[PDB]
């Protein structure tokens, strides 16, 4: 499998947070939020790639998408409440603490991301490892 939709939108969900290094390029606080809400959009389309492998899941995908997915639904959450305790502390210089963990935390939902994209992308393999012995 050359890692169907499945890996090509979690790929989107990195893409999303590219989204999220973009978003506070140019714009202030109050798009760290909406920049976040780009990676929150990655793990909403992704639903759409996880109703994919999701029928992948009684194929075998069973294994991952509780792993990744559960990872990623926590650990997304977090961003979206690093954009939320970023817009929460919004402070010209005190900001940065808040900043700093969320970016430490972005890291954590981007190995979030990261691994559901290469599990999922399993999940699709997964379809395969049924087919692989028929």
Known sequence: RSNDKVYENVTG?????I???SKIQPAPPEEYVPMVKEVGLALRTLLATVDESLPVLPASTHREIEMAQKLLNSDLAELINKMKLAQQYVMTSLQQEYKKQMLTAAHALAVDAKNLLDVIDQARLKMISQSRPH
Do not use: G, H, N, T
């Not at 969900?13 to 947070?17: N, Y």
């Open 13 to 17: 969900l990195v893409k999303a947070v």
């Open 19 to 21: 989204e999220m290094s």
